[PDB]
Amino acid sequence: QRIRIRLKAFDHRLIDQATAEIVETAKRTGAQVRGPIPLPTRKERFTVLISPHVNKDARDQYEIRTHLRLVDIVEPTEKTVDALMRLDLAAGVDVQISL
């Protein structure tokens, strides 16, 4: 069928590096690959009072951006499956596979 990998991480330059790794590996190991597609970034936000007591207008405004990548692999050639499946990827990337 197909194997699709969802990649999410807080850092972009680092996420598409992990993406790049996977795609290339696939492309070299003679897999056919749809993607990588940029799936919309879900940015949480936080607003917190900046003073320990009172001064309600004094605040910090933080956000955590969560980046999303879809890697779609058309042919699951076993060499490809082994190629991918012991890649060494950035620790701070969460990798999901659909089967």
């Binding site: 309600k56 605040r59 405004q61």
Partner: protein, 127 residues
């Protein structure tokens, strides 16, 4: 081949496909009259066909999402002109002078901490 123009305004975005023959207008599968209950806004989509002349000369087939009434009508205005310029580009000087080429960049301004709105400030008591 179709002649195309993208137009957008506020959070709206209108795609605009030109072809010769008639005074037909179909926004989102619907008629111009049907889509816009306001007849003024109807005029703005017509405008790019003023200086540039269509009566029964070309078909514009369009669609749009985002924003509201005037956003969608502004955005379509904009996209037509781009599709007109696509057809010749000589036309522009007229369109420039019209004010129709420009992408109106005025977005709603964000709401800021300590303020009631983007600028409205909490009423100030002296004592």
């Amino acid at each position: 081949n179709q002649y195309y123009g993208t137009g957008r305004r506020k959070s709206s975005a209108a795609r605009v496909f030109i072809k010769p023959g008639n005074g037909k207008i179909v926004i989102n599968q619907r008629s111009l009259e049907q889509y816009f209950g306001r007849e003024t806004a109807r005029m703005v989509v017509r405008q790019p066909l003023e200086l540039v002349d269509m009566v029964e000369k070309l078909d514009l087939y369009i669609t749009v999402k985002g924003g509201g009434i005037s956003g969608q009508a502004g955005a379509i205005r904009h996209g037509i002109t781009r599709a007109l310029m696509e057809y010749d580009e000589s036309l522009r000087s007229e369109l420039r002078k019209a004010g129709f080429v420009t992408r109106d960049a005025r977005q709603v301004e964000r709401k800021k901490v300590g303020l009631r709105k983007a600028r409205r400030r909490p009423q100030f008591s002296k004592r």
